[PDB]
């Protein structure tokens, strides 16, 4: 009864990566836990729109951490964003343009993603297969905005490789950089993480990490799994994730998180 807040990621934890569907028993149990006074936080790499749809039946009662920790919001208002300073994302744009010309790039806000090339295969994949809201513009460096939460570099097959000689060392002390496969390099504001964002909420509600329960499945969940008073790793996760967590639960295809949540009722 010491748990005052529960945070969980989604993809590969509650549902198959990218799923739009989730067992309604999750909604009933979470609603019941919230009614018992527990704060429930969806904490994911996903965009707000995606989280808000998946949890549609009880969307009004949740807190949301989106885009890997760059936005923290209630159903009606943004509490905190971790945007990138203009010199950082515009500087990145200029560098990719001038020094990594074989690569493409994108600049994202919480609501949409800016691109200079709307005719590319990857642009089409993002918009029409992944369902991202995209906005084509002539020049990202000419935008006037205060909500750039991610700058991303793309190459079909050697993105990180091309970014390594100059881009990565030029920015990795000034921003948070992470490769994704052979095709992407994602950059966010320095210090951004799921735990940073979650800590913001923990503090806001005058709680302590010891009063938190986290569920996860990814190496990027390790810090929250370690810092939370109680935590669970899905059993199909990597060894390091399992080791970070206080316990394990069953995979999403066995509704493992559901079973633990029920045990808190």
Q: How was this structure determined?
A: X-ray
Distance CA 249, CA 233 (A): 6
What is the CA angle 214-216-221, rounded to 5? Answer: 90
41-55: buried (b, 16+ CB within 10 Å) or exposed (e) per residue?
A: bbbbbbbbebbbebb
* Termini Cα distance of the chain: 9
Distance CA 80, CA 88 (A): 19
Distance CA 223, CA 60 (A): 28
- Looking at the structure, do residues 174 and 214 belong to the same domain, yes or no? no
When divided into structural domains, the chain yields a total of 2
* Residues 10/62, Cβ–Cβ less than 8 Å: no
* Residues 56/77, Cβ–Cβ less than 8 Å: no
- Looking at the structure, do residues 15 and 77 belong to the same domain, yes or no? yes
Look at the chain and count its residues: 265
Q: Tell which of 134, 164, 191 closes a domain.
A: 191
Q: Which residues touch 68 (CB under 8 Å, ≥6 apart)?
A: 44, 45, 188, 192, 193, 194, 220
- Looking at the structure, do residues 181 and 122 belong to the same domain, yes or no? yes
Helix axis angle, 24-35 relative to 256-263, nearest 10°? 30
CA distances from 157 to 104, 125, 127, 171 (A): 12, 16, 20, 21
The sign one gets for the Cα dihedral 250, 196, 114, 53 is positive
- Looking at the structure, do residues 101 and 171 belong to the same domain, yes or no? yes
Resolution, expressed in angstroms to one decimal: 1.8
> What DSSP string runs through the chain?
----EEEE--BTTTBSTT-S---HHHHHHHHHHHHTT-EEEEE-SS-HHHHHHHTGGGGGG-EEEETTTTEEE-SS-EEEE-PPPHHHHHHHHHHHHHH-TT-EEEEE-SS-EEES-TTSHHHHHHHHTS---EEE-S-GGG---S---EEEEE-SS-HHHHHTTTHHHHHTTTEEEEEETTTEEEEEETT--HHHHHHHHHHHTT--GGGEEEEE-SGGGHHHHHHSSEEEEETTS-HHHHHHSSEEE--GGGTHHHHHHHHT-
Distance CA 181, CA 218 (A): 15
- Looking at the structure, do residues 152 and 236 belong to the same domain, yes or no? no
- Looking at the structure, do residues 178 and 98 belong to the same domain, yes or no? yes
Structure tokens at 259: 């079973």
Distance CA 107, CA 13 (A): 28
Distance CA 232, CA 100 (A): 41
What is the CA angle 5-150-43, rounded to 5? Answer: 15
Neighbours of 37 (CB within 10 A): 9
**Cα-to-chain-centroid distance, residue 71:** 9
- Looking at the structure, do residues 89 and 44 belong to the same domain, yes or no? no
Distance CA 238, CA 240 (A): 5
Q: Residue 235's domain spans which residues?
A: 1-82+192-265
Distance CA 236, CA 128 (A): 30
Q: Tell which of 131, 161, 191 closes a domain.
A: 191
**Farthest-apart Cα atoms in the chain, separation:** 57
- Looking at the structure, do residues 90 and 124 belong to the same domain, yes or no? yes
The CATH number of the domain holding residue 248 is: 3.40.50.1000
Q: Tell which of 191, 210, 242 closes a domain.
A: 191
Checking DSSP bridges between strand 230-234 and strand 39-43, what pairing results, if any? unpaired
Distance CA 190, CA 13 (A): 27
* Residues 189/84, Cβ–Cβ less than 8 Å: yes
The CATH number of the domain holding residue 161 is: 3.30.1240.10
- Looking at the structure, do residues 111 and 97 belong to the same domain, yes or no? yes
* Residues 237/253, Cβ–Cβ less than 8 Å: no
What is the CA angle 69-71-74, rounded to 5? Answer: 120
- Looking at the structure, do residues 134 and 259 belong to the same domain, yes or no? no
- Looking at the structure, do residues 185 and 212 belong to the same domain, yes or no? no
- Looking at the structure, do residues 67 and 98 belong to the same domain, yes or no? no
- Residue 200's nearest CA partner among 72, 22, 103 is 72
10 Å CB burial of residue 172 (0-12, 13-18, 19+) is: middle
* Residues 30/58, Cβ–Cβ less than 8 Å: yes
């Amino acid at each position: 009864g010491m748990i005052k807040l529960i945070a969980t990621d989604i993809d590969g934890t509650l549902v198959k990566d990218g799923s739009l569907l989730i067992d309604p028993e999750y909604m009933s149990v979470i609603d019941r836990l919230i009614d018992k006074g527990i704060i429930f936080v969806v904490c994911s790499g996903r965009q707000f729109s995606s989280e808000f749809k998946l949890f549609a039946p009880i969307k009004h009662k949740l807190l949301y951490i989106t885009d890997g920790g760059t936005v923290v919001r209630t159903p009606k208002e943004i509490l905190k964003t971790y945007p990138m300073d203009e010199d950082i994302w515009k500087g990145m744009c200029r560098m990719v343009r001038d020094e990594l010309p074989a690569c493409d790039y994108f600049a994202a806000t919480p609501d949409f993603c800016f691109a200079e090339d709307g005719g590319s295969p990857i642009f089409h994949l993002l918009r029409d297969s992944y369902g991202f809201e995209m906005r084509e513009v002539d020049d990202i460096t000419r935008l006037d905005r205060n909500d750039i939460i991610k700058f991303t570099v793309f190459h079909p097959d050697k993105c990180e490789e091309l970014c390594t000689p100059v881009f990565i060392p030029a920015w990795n002390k000034k921003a948070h950089l992470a490769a994704a496969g052979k095709e992407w390099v994602d950059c966010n504001a320095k210090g951004v993480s799921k735990w940073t964002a979650l800590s913001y909420l923990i503090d806001r509600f005058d709680l302590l990490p010891d009063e938190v329960c986290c569920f996860g499945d990814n190496l990027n969940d390790i810090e929250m799994l370690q810092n939370a008073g109680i935590s669970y790793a899905v059993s199909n996760a990597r060894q390091e994730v399992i080791a970070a967590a206080k316990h394990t639960c069953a995979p999403y295809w066995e509704n493992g998180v559901l079973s633990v949540l029920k045990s808190f009722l």
